Design a protein around this motif. Structure first.
Motif, PDB file in Angstrom:
ATOM      1  N   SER A 190      -0.233 -23.531 -30.864  1.00 40.85           N
ATOM      2  CA  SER A 190      -0.885 -22.280 -31.212  1.00 40.85           C
ATOM      3  C   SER A 190      -1.515 -21.654 -29.966  1.00 40.85           C
ATOM      4  N   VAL A 191      -1.482 -22.413 -28.881  1.00 41.31           N
ATOM      5  CA  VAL A 191      -2.044 -21.947 -27.625  1.00 41.31           C
ATOM      6  C   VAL A 191      -0.947 -21.270 -26.799  1.00 41.31           C
ATOM      7  N   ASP A 192       0.223 -21.890 -26.810  1.00 37.90           N
ATOM      8  CA  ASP A 192       1.357 -21.360 -26.070  1.00 37.90           C
ATOM      9  C   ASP A 192       1.592 -19.905 -26.480  1.00 37.90           C
ATOM     10  N   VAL A 193       1.337 -19.632 -27.751  1.00 41.00           N
ATOM     11  CA  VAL A 193       1.515 -18.290 -28.279  1.00 41.00           C
ATOM     12  C   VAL A 193       0.742 -17.297 -27.410  1.00 41.00           C
ATOM     13  N   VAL A 194      -0.516 -17.632 -27.163  1.00 40.59           N
ATOM     14  CA  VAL A 194      -1.370 -16.781 -26.350  1.00 40.59           C
ATOM     15  C   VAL A 194      -0.930 -16.872 -24.888  1.00 40.59           C
ATOM     16  N   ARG A 195      -0.520 -18.070 -24.499  1.00 38.15           N
ATOM     17  CA  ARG A 195      -0.073 -18.302 -23.136  1.00 38.15           C
ATOM     18  C   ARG A 195       1.140 -17.425 -22.819  1.00 38.15           C
ATOM     19  N   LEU A 196       2.145 -17.527 -23.677  1.00 40.10           N
ATOM     20  CA  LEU A 196       3.361 -16.753 -23.500  1.00 40.10           C
ATOM     21  C   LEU A 196       3.011 -15.263 -23.464  1.00 40.10           C
ATOM     22  N   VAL A 197       2.191 -14.857 -24.423  1.00 34.03           N
ATOM     23  CA  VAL A 197       1.774 -13.469 -24.512  1.00 34.03           C
ATOM     24  C   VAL A 197       0.962 -13.104 -23.268  1.00 34.03           C
ATOM     25  N   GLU A 198       0.096 -14.027 -22.874  1.00 37.56           N
ATOM     26  CA  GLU A 198      -0.743 -13.816 -21.706  1.00 37.56           C
ATOM     27  C   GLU A 198       0.113 -13.764 -20.439  1.00 37.56           C
ATOM     28  N   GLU A 199       1.072 -14.676 -20.374  1.00 41.24           N
ATOM     29  CA  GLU A 199       1.963 -14.744 -19.229  1.00 41.24           C
ATOM     30  C   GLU A 199       2.756 -13.443 -19.094  1.00 41.24           C
ATOM     31  N   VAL A 200       3.455 -13.100 -20.166  1.00 41.63           N
ATOM     32  CA  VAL A 200       4.256 -11.887 -20.181  1.00 41.63           C
ATOM     33  C   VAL A 200       3.355 -10.682 -19.902  1.00 41.63           C
TER      34      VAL A 200
ATOM     35  N   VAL B 139       4.747 -12.891 -31.252  1.00 41.28           N
ATOM     36  CA  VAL B 139       5.289 -14.238 -31.189  1.00 41.28           C
ATOM     37  C   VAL B 139       5.660 -14.701 -32.599  1.00 41.28           C
ATOM     38  N   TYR B 140       4.722 -14.509 -33.516  1.00 41.34           N
ATOM     39  CA  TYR B 140       4.936 -14.900 -34.898  1.00 41.34           C
ATOM     40  C   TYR B 140       6.101 -14.122 -35.515  1.00 41.34           C
ATOM     41  N   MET B 141       6.452 -13.027 -34.856  1.00 42.83           N
ATOM     42  CA  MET B 141       7.543 -12.189 -35.327  1.00 42.83           C
ATOM     43  C   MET B 141       8.860 -12.576 -34.653  1.00 42.83           C
ATOM     44  N   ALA B 142       8.788 -12.758 -33.343  1.00 45.82           N
ATOM     45  CA  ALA B 142       9.962 -13.129 -32.573  1.00 45.82           C
ATOM     46  C   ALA B 142       9.741 -14.506 -31.942  1.00 45.82           C
ATOM     47  N   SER B 143      10.045 -15.533 -32.720  1.00 38.82           N
ATOM     48  CA  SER B 143       9.884 -16.899 -32.253  1.00 38.82           C
ATOM     49  C   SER B 143      10.973 -17.235 -31.233  1.00 38.82           C
ATOM     50  N   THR B 144      12.172 -16.741 -31.511  1.00 36.58           N
ATOM     51  CA  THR B 144      13.302 -16.980 -30.630  1.00 36.58           C
ATOM     52  C   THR B 144      13.242 -16.045 -29.420  1.00 36.58           C
ATOM     53  N   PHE B 145      13.716 -16.558 -28.293  1.00 37.04           N
ATOM     54  CA  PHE B 145      13.721 -15.783 -27.065  1.00 37.04           C
ATOM     55  C   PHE B 145      14.544 -14.503 -27.227  1.00 37.04           C
ATOM     56  N   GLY B 146      15.786 -14.686 -27.650  1.00 43.30           N
ATOM     57  CA  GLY B 146      16.682 -13.559 -27.850  1.00 43.30           C
ATOM     58  C   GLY B 146      15.964 -12.406 -28.554  1.00 43.30           C
ATOM     59  N   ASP B 147      15.415 -12.717 -29.720  1.00 47.90           N
ATOM     60  CA  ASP B 147      14.701 -11.720 -30.500  1.00 47.90           C
ATOM     61  C   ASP B 147      13.503 -11.212 -29.696  1.00 47.90           C
ATOM     62  N   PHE B 148      12.679 -12.155 -29.262  1.00 45.31           N
ATOM     63  CA  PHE B 148      11.498 -11.817 -28.486  1.00 45.31           C
ATOM     64  C   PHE B 148      11.835 -10.803 -27.390  1.00 45.31           C
ATOM     65  N   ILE B 149      12.806 -11.169 -26.568  1.00 47.02           N
ATOM     66  CA  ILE B 149      13.231 -10.305 -25.479  1.00 47.02           C
ATOM     67  C   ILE B 149      13.330  -8.865 -25.986  1.00 47.02           C
ATOM     68  N   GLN B 150      14.173  -8.683 -26.992  1.00 45.08           N
ATOM     69  CA  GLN B 150      14.369  -7.366 -27.575  1.00 45.08           C
ATOM     70  C   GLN B 150      13.020  -6.681 -27.803  1.00 45.08           C
ATOM     71  N   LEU B 151      12.102  -7.433 -28.392  1.00 44.74           N
ATOM     72  CA  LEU B 151      10.774  -6.913 -28.672  1.00 44.74           C
ATOM     73  C   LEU B 151      10.061  -6.612 -27.351  1.00 44.74           C
ATOM     74  N   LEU B 152      10.117  -7.583 -26.451  1.00 42.59           N
ATOM     75  CA  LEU B 152       9.483  -7.436 -25.152  1.00 42.59           C
ATOM     76  C   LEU B 152      10.052  -6.201 -24.449  1.00 42.59           C
ATOM     77  N   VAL B 153      11.357  -6.238 -24.222  1.00 44.75           N
ATOM     78  CA  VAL B 153      12.033  -5.135 -23.562  1.00 44.75           C
ATOM     79  C   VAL B 153      11.552  -3.814 -24.165  1.00 44.75           C
ATOM     80  N   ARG B 154      11.385  -3.826 -25.479  1.00 45.07           N
ATOM     81  CA  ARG B 154      10.932  -2.641 -26.188  1.00 45.07           C
ATOM     82  C   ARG B 154       9.551  -2.217 -25.683  1.00 45.07           C
ATOM     83  N   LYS B 155       8.677  -3.203 -25.546  1.00 39.95           N
ATOM     84  CA  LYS B 155       7.327  -2.948 -25.076  1.00 39.95           C
ATOM     85  C   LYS B 155       7.372  -2.546 -23.601  1.00 39.95           C
ATOM     86  N   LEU B 156       8.327  -3.130 -22.891  1.00 40.87           N
ATOM     87  CA  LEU B 156       8.488  -2.843 -21.475  1.00 40.87           C
ATOM     88  C   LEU B 156       8.966  -1.399 -21.303  1.00 40.87           C
ATOM     89  N   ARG B 157      10.096  -1.105 -21.931  1.00 41.90           N
ATOM     90  CA  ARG B 157      10.668   0.229 -21.855  1.00 41.90           C
ATOM     91  C   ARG B 157       9.584   1.285 -22.079  1.00 41.90           C
TER      92      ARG B 157
END
Length: 110
Positions: free
Chosen positions: A57-67, A81-99
């Motif tokens: 439950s810490v990595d969640v913040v870590r990953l989010v904090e890291e990114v 994170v709770y939405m996109a547990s998988t990298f593939g999915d996450f990426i899409q979400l991330l990229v979205r936030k990035l874009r």
């Protein structure tokens, strides 16, 4: 042209987002996070679940904090994170936030 197996329907560039010469790099930067985090995990695929892997439950913040440092204050949340547990999915979400990028300053008490 090509023949066999029909399947025509409006749709130009759909299903999953398409990275970019840059985004790709970023997507790779995030991967390092997972890897770095997830020890046992020898490789991080688009099918690798940030949870199943061995994240707490810490990595969640870590990953989010890291990114977060990746985009320098990425508008991410534990939910993501709770939405996109998988990298593939996450990426899409991330990229979205990035874009998107750029946030809307609020009241911010502090």
């Amino acid at each position: 042209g090509s023949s066999g197996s029909s399947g025509f329907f409006k749709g130009a560039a759909s299903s999953v987002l398409e990275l970019t010469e840059a985004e790709l790099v970023t997507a790779e930067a995030v991967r390092s996070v997972w890897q770095r985090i997830l020890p046992k995990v020898l490789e991080v695929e688009d099918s690798t679940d940030f949870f199943k892997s061995g994240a707490a439950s810490v990595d969640v913040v870590r990953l989010v904090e890291e990114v977060k440092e990746l985009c320098d204050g990425l508008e991410l949340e534990n939910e993501d994170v709770y939405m996109a547990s998988t990298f593939g999915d996450f990426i899409q979400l991330l990229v979205r936030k990035l874009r998107g990028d750029d946030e809307e300053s609020g009241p911010s008490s502090g």
